[PDB]
Amino acid sequence: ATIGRISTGSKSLDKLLGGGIETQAITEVFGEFGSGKTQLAHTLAVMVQLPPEEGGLNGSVMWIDTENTFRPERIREIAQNRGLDPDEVLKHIAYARAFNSNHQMLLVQQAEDMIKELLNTDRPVKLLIVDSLTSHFRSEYIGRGALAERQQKLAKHLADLHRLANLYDIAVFVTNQVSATLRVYLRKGKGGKRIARLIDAPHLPEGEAVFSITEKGIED
Numbered sequence: 001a002t003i004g005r006i007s008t009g010s011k012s013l014d015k016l017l018g019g020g021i022e023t024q025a026i027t028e029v030f031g032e033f034g035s036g037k038t039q040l041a042h043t044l045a046v047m048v049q050l051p052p053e054e055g056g057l058n059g060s061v062m063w064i065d066t067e068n069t070f071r072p073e074r075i076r077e078i079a080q081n082r083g084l085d086p087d088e089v090l091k092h093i094a095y096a097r098a099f100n101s102n103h104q105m106l107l108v109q110q111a112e113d114m115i116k117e118l119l120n121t122d123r124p125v126k127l128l129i130v131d132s133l134t135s136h137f138r139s140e141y142i143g144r145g146a147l148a149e150r151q152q153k154l155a156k157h158l159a160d161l162h163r164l165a166n167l168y169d170i171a172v173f174v175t176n177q178v179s180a181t182l183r184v185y186l187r188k189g190k191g192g193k194r195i196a197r198l199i200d201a202p203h204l205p206e207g208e209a210v211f212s213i214t215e216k217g218i219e220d
């Protein structure tokens with residue numbers, strides 16, 4: 001199927017990304033605390049539910065949360081400020097807490113069931129979020145005696161995510177802290193604005209986009 005794109009809410013950021021985040025791809029967003037990466041995740045979980053003319057893909061969402069950063073009230077706020085029904089928007093985000101790295105990998109394997117169920121419906125899964133990709137791996141695999149297994153497991157986890165993205169035409173969006181993925185780095189700009197820098201994209205030029213965080217989530 002043709003690659004679909006989900007608007008981030010920011011015209012500047014969308015332009016940097018070639019139109020928005022892509023289905024059949026893993027977009028990996030890095031940032032320190034308060035960078036805006038989780039705000040971006042929340043915004044995407046709303047935007048994807050819009051029709052294409054409004055920057056979405058008429059899709060449902062699946063969200064894997066590793067350190068309790070999902071905020072249903074923030075979803076409701078973004079939904080309402082963008083004219084959507086906050087209750088309907090929340091209903092179409094399937095939520096799962098991942099308690100550890102094994103569980104996180106299991107949840108990705110098990111997500112395929114719901115993806116299959118929704119595939120030929122009015123609201124197929126179009127966005128799968130993992131926030132954060134690495135918190136559990138960093139917590140569990142300490143030192144150099146553990147690095148090899150950590151990388152192996154992470155590599156397998158990324159492969160599972162790539163497969164879901166490609167097979168079912170889903171945009172996978174993961175957060176991280178410092179191919180295979182499209183890497184975007186967030187930092188604080190001036191006056192409370194945030195800056196995104198695209199790095200090492202095979203077919204998009206590097207560049208930067210400045211954006212804001214509002215009651216609409218993110219926008220220019």
Ligand SMILES: Oc1cccc2ccccc12
Nearest residue numbers: 062094095096107110111
């Ligand atoms: O495997 C999953 C991943 C993300 C969300 C889920 C929600 C319900 C059941 C399973 C889920």
